[model samples]
Target chain A: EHLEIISLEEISMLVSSDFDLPEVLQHVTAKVATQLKVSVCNIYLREGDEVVLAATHGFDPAFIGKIRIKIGDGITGSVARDGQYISLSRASQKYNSMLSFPIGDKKEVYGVINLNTTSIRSFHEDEIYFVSIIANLILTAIKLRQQVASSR
Target chain B: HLEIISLEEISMLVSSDFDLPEVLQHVTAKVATQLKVSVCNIYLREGDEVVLAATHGFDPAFIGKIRIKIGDGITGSVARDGQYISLSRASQDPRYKYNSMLSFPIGDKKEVYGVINLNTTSIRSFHEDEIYFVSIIANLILTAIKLRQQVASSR
Candidate 1:
């Protein structure tokens, strides 16, 4: 509960402030990792038919903004392509569970949020649902900020 | 598991184009169904009292009529402490015959926005994991409420 509360506070701070996209994504990844007690949490922004890595927690900083995946490439791609929540167990030797959520409204698709656990454990439905909500919040914030920018 | 799915659906609906009262009603209904409870009530902080904002399966007449001080009762205590409370016991009073009750504060460290109350007729022990899940839902509610307020203020 302590970690979850902190994560919630961080998200609240992000929404109430005027942080740039990069900073927002960074905060999201870091908070998600802390909340889930995971090692890697990454945010990928959709670019055309592909998603490009935008932020990361516990991942090498050099890889951020460097990796790209097609809309149907991997779990992340599937989530973007179909706009569905996808969770995989034993995703890798180093990580236990991998969860990917689409980050867009019904009219269009924006990007994806991906999380990976440090140890081998199955991701619960509640966890998946919680992360999905966070992804939606991120999408809303991005759209709202864009609206503000266009009006200026 | 179904509860988690409902939570996801509720989050999606809130993120979409929706009204505040509609969302609050949906939250009570969804939470009631998810927890298999007889009643789900949402109290919002207003001035020095926590006002009954929404409800499902409870007396409709009580809505907006019931108010608790910030430090009184379970719901108010949760609002005052910014913490969650879960209890299970037999009640001697018919008006409070709930066997289990769960109350969660709906805001973060910077604010105490409100409280959500869930009650069941049968005794049920909530697990730690379930409590954590409810906490996440509470955060979602806080975000949705804030978003609505921001939208209203901008107009």
Candidate 2:
């Protein structure tokens, strides 16, 4: 098989768990890189009107909780702005391949997930489908937490 | 206000944020709720059959399990014919089981990708505005599918 189909129920449980959003997202990137065999995975959550780096698998920990990317500014920024995945490559870069996917719903996008590899890579159809499904569940989990907080 | 907002949100929903099944699921539910229809179903063409991809009123388990030939049922007929059909008194017709039904093909003249069907408990003529809006929704769905496929194959 070219790709592994992740269990949505497992992701659903992980996102819905009471581990807090940042912890949950950190585990998400951790799991994503392991399964997809990518060099990096990052998550950017929206705060007020800006997107901030919240979790990462391969980046320095110092990059988290401080870096903010405007909605149309950087790689993840453009992803959140368009609500579409982007794939790019470069021969000179350390991480030669990269992709960013939007975690969103109809009303608005909540964040983005970025994946990177050390060499050029082309994605499979099912790979994109599974990642997009994970993105959907992330959005659902984010909304659920918001509603729970607001209702209480 | 509901229709206007629904279209705008749907436009954003389908044009990006690519998950074919999940997005289709949301579209069916939104159509049923916003339009106040008794049933809303989407069938995607595959091989010589059109499989039930999503629905609001029908049993959720039936999705992907229910398949109709390209020209068999009313839904399939719409996919094959590439035209809208309003079946008045659908229960009286042997081809269907609802009091009223409206079926629209989600495709252009070249090729139909699937069909979207709406049913009501009381038979009545659909308003010109309702028809126009539903047509727009079908076209949006068609465009979304094509766009998603292209995105997938781009790799």
Candidate 3:
């Protein structure tokens, strides 16, 4: 599969230009999942001990509202604490419970990018870097949306 | 005894108004000058990759290069291990390729924000006194990050 045109800066500019948070996020998560060839892509924001799943691609929406992980409970929780990337190259051996989530035809997380990525790996480091840059952009967009809601 | 600046004085120096890259660059130069070192630099962890934000008396073209991973280099190793480092010899040192370097953390409430690295052309052991002095500076940098976070969340 060809990994092409995965640029966060371009997406950030698009987000800024249109002022559409959902559309931006939808584009971002979809692009990442497609490039990585993963059936699941999710973005979560940490608040106190819980991680609220803000966005998802290829995951059931019903699971979204109810799924909550403590700050140190799950894989995502550990990433939040460490603020570093992790790779579950073997999802079957590492996470049996994760299989229950119905990821469908995908195995192992290729990479988990934090707020940024600059390291070399099996995948293009540029793609990983772009993921983090996009995450920061999404965080800022979420803040802007909140502001607009309060003002209205 | 060298005249010491109070923590409060150090706290005030960390400013969001100044560009972060510029501030780190200034810090590199200031550290090198104060420590009588030839080179100094700062590497910040952004997501999974490490970004060299600033450098003093080193190649400017090297800036913005993603050179290391989470556990690469003396700076990266120290950060990964959460330890302080000082080395006299560049070639013999097993921890890193460079010699005569001192590095400490720039931590915030959540974690280490970045690292400060000092180097010299001549190899010499970095003494305990120097470590203590640099640690104080690191703590002050952390405090600045915490204060800024508070201010940001308030807005």
Chain A TM per prediction: 0.85, 0.85, 0.61
Error of 1 at B63 (Å): 2.8
Write the residue-wise lDDT of candidate 2 on B1-155 in tens digits. Answer: 12143323433454455577878787888788767888899999999999998999999899979898989987778988898898776455456344778898887645899989888887677777677667766765775675557534641
> Which candidate do you rate higher for lDDT, 1 or 3?
1
TM-score of chain B as predicted in candidate 1: 0.85
The segments of candidate 2 whose C-alpha lies over 4 angstroms from its true place after superposition are A1-152, B1-3, B6-8, B90-98
Please give the clash total of every predicted structure, in order.
0, 0, 4
Model 1: per-residue lDDT, tens digit, A1-152?
A: 11224333454445544557787788888878987888789988888879999889978868986999998788888888888768777745454777788888756778888887756777876677678777776787676566456644
lDDT of 1: 0.75
Flag regions of model 3 displaced more than 4 Å: A1-152, B4-12, B90-98, B108-110
- The residue pairs found clashing in candidate 2 are none
- As for lDDT, the candidate ahead, 2 or 3, is 2
Residue B104's lDDT in candidate 3: 76
- Candidate 3 or 1, higher DockQ: 1
Q: Write the per-residue lDDT of candidate 1 for residues B1-155, one digit (tens) a residue.
A: 21244434545455646776677777788778876778999999999889987899777678789899989887888989987889998778456354888999987646799998888888898878667656766766776776667644652
Q: lDDT tens string, model 3, B25-132?
A: 666666677677788777776776567878887787899874667777888876666577777764653563445888777763346677878777675788886776
Q: Give a tens-digit lDDT track for model 3, residues A43-143.
A: 66655666666556766755546667676666666665555555433334333112111110112221222221122224455545445444444544454
DockQ of 1: 0.10
